[PDB]
């Protein structure tokens, strides 16, 4: 819902509201998930040249029982855009690596998940400089590349995306925070298909799980999606994090051991633009052992149902 | 204040601000309690046949001190509405119970109260799949009935509803986690007349106070109200409920003895529908004794004074 | 955005995201200092005579990493203003020093600062029962008087402002919570020209860095600032708190010292009303000593940007 447009400022307000249900043994999945979001996207023009911007999405879950507060701004950032010299935007806002390996996250409940949201840059962060210019200059049309600076430790990024004309993509960002990672990824966008694939190297994952971080970090993601025309994408998937030489902060070591693996079989069923429903079943791999027991890490399969409602 | 409207999709966007105060003697009584909610409903129709909405409606606190937060999720969830055969709606809701416990929930500051939100089902709780059925398939006119299910743990749920055509109603609810509870309740509204009671027989209370749950709890609660046409809805009201065998989670025991009992008056008086003042002088009768010291219930006579403002 | 109007109700949603950074050696300055501010002003038309209205301003910040929560309701209340006779509102809101104070309070990222929020009274509160009366009953034009009343301990204030016709303005205020704060301000609102300067006496400061309260304490805060034409706004700024006799709440003492002390190079650079970019450089002149050291007063010289966005 784009509630304000008047004199060259619009203002979007979106929302969610999603109520789901887990499946699985692991205590600490099944059960309810249902949560909230509550946005707004902004929008001031001037000139013809330039115009400014400025962003917020709030996630608060609906699952935690009265007297309790769960949240974090998912992204809050302002910035500016200059016709033909892309844009700059300061603030909590997805890392520049997202821009490749966001195309494999895409499935009805689950995924992206190798990389977590303060996981040194490959999804969200903090104090954020991004700048993005797309189209090349207005010079090479299709070739968007991004340059970025994480807050704290520092780091610095880049990522070029390309969708060779059609609806083939390719994908490429490296991040290093201060500790690289890498990243490749592959998109097919055309006739109700989706095909998206991307991996990537790294230095150390650190924060993950509850076990301290590698000295090398190797995950791949891919998933086939259809767009049946009555509202239906079946949605199947794999993705895998393999780790190295793992320490508990002190000692401990757990060494070479899988960090997440699994097929995914999912549907999401469009309603409408606004009213979805959804069935995800994770066909999870892993064993439960040492390396996945201390550190909580999930060995259950897992199946969730959702009714989300937007706006 | 219904915010957006286009192509058949609806979005309302209420809240209110609520600046009052308490007077008692019992510290953690007398003082502000300024709070503010802000929701959101929402609408989205697909067809002639089926309506998809989706709700939320928060409550923060306003009189906490610079640095802190006081808030929860008062509800969130997602459903579908199909043309005669009522709806579904999975997410933090209003236990089917309060169908017909609300009936007495209408005082200008205190009431409902013998149960609490996540009192195992009396008023709200968490993973909620509610079914509603309106006016029994189109068939049965005046005669709604609900059945739920609530989240961890387990539980059932049954209410059935009926105003007899006129004013009179009838109210009927059954509640069983796993612990069954029992509700009946009567509301007459006419000729600007409210009386409404209800009562319920439970299992156990559990989450009561900071000590355990009984054996067997008696909860009754029954008010009339006038709505005079300058705006001014004096209301008084008696509620109360009784316990059994009530352990300190660990031994205990603290036996028979009232959990709240009072006679209320207030008087509420509607400015417009968006500004209302009230005053509302809650008559305790309850007496300092050791189930109520050590448990903290308020054994207090409160008189409350606040000016809402909605929209 | 003012988002709803309809039959003499107006209710306005604003928001602001400002990203932004800070430099400085002392660590607890250095980094990101992103935030966002939601809030809603509203009002309700009955009568003629009198208006209903209510607000609401949240802080959220969005410096803090994902999982965690940092905000605070900024103020919210409910009021009644009837024609020629002020206005009324009950609950979290600006002290009514505030209303003198606030003359200083306009550099482009610090300021105001000798004062706290539920520092006592000088800026916000809750409780909070003013009683606001402009233009003093129609009779005496330019001529505002507010009185106020705070929650809990108890309080009492009072503030006179008066522009002496012009854009010169005189102010005046005195604040008692039980602990007497005095204050003075002088601004000059002309000529795209902006000349500010107020300061105050009291008994107590108590909530102070992190050590107990002073038996006097003298603040005093001055500004002058242009308003070029392009947008572009840069202020020079001088403000600075002397103490007295100051305990570690138990014992301690730590005397005769300054408390903050800082001249202020600033330009705050005005794109549209919708969205500014501004440069803020705090000249700190504080020794890092004892008091300073123990209590965390900060003694380092600080230097801020960032790109806000309203709405
Ligand atoms: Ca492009
Ligand atoms: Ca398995
Ligand atoms: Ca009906
Ligand atoms: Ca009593
Ligand atoms: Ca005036
Ligand atoms: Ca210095
Ligand atoms: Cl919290
Ligand atoms: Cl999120
Ligand atoms: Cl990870
Ligand atoms: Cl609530
Ligand atoms: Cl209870
Ligand atoms: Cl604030
Ligand atoms: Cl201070």
């Given at each position: 819902?784009?509630?304000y447009?008047?004199?060259g ?5 979106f ?9 699985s ?7 309810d998930?249902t949560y909230?979001?509550i946005?707004?996207?902004?929008e001031?023009?001037?000139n013809?040249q330039?115009?400014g911007?400025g962003?917020?999405?709030?996630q608060?879950?609906?699952n935690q ?7 974090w701004t ?7 855009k ?5 844009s700059f ?15 494999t996250?895409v499935?009805?409940?689950?995924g992206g998940d190798?990389?977590?949201?303060d996981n ?7 104090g954020y400089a991004?700048?993005?210019n ?5 010079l090479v049309?299709?070739?968007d590349?991004?340059?970025?600076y ?7 990024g880049?990522?070029?995306?390309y969708?060779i004309?059609?609806?083939f993509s ?20 055309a006739?109700?298909?989706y095909?998206?694939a ?15 971080f590698?000295?090398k970090?190797?995950?791949?993601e891919?998933v086939?999606?259809?767009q049946f ?10 993705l895998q994090?393999?780790?190295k030489?793992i320490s ?6 757990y060494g ?13 069923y469009?309603?409408?633009?606004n009213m979805?429903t959804?069935?995800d ?18 060995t259950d ?11």
């Amino acid at each position: 819902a784009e509630i304000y447009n008047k004199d060259g400022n619009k203002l979007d307000l979106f929302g969610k509201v999603d109520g789901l249900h887990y499946f699985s043994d692991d205590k600490g999945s099944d059960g309810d998930q249902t949560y909230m979001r509550i946005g707004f996207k902004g929008e001031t023009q001037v000139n013809d040249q330039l115009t400014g911007y400025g962003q917020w999405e709030y996630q608060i879950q609906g699952n935690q029982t009265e007297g309790s507060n769960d949240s974090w701004t998912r992204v809050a950032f302002a910035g500016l855009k200059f016709a033909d010299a892309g844009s700059f935007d300061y603030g909590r806002n997805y890392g520049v690596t997202y821009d490749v390996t966001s195309w494999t996250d895409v499935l009805p409940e689950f995924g992206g998940d190798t990389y977590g949201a303060d996981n040194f840059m490959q999804q969200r962060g903090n104090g954020y400089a991004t700048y993005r210019n797309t189209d090349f200059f207005g010079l090479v049309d299709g070739l968007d590349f991004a340059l970025q600076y994480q807050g704290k430790g520092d780091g610095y990024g880049g990522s070029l995306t390309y969708a060779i004309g059609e609806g083939f993509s390719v994908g490429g960002a490296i991040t290093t925070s201060k500790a690289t990672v890498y990243t490749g990824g592959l998109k097919y966008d055309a006739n109700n298909i989706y095909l998206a694939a991307q991996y990537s190297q790294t230095y150390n994952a650190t924060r993950f799980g509850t076990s301290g971080f590698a000295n090398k970090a190797q995950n791949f993601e891919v998933v086939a999606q259809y767009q049946f025309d009555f509202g239906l994408r079946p949605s199947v998937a794999y993705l895998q994090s393999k780790g190295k030489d793992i320490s508990n902060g002190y000692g401990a070591s757990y060494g070479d051991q899988d960090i997440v693996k699994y097929v995914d079989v999912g549907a999401t069923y469009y309603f409408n633009k606004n009213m979805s429903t959804y069935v995800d079943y994770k066909i999870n791999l892993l064993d439960k052992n040492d390396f996945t027991r201390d550190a909580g890490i999930n060995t259950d399969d897992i199946v969730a149902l959702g009714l989300v409602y937007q706006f």
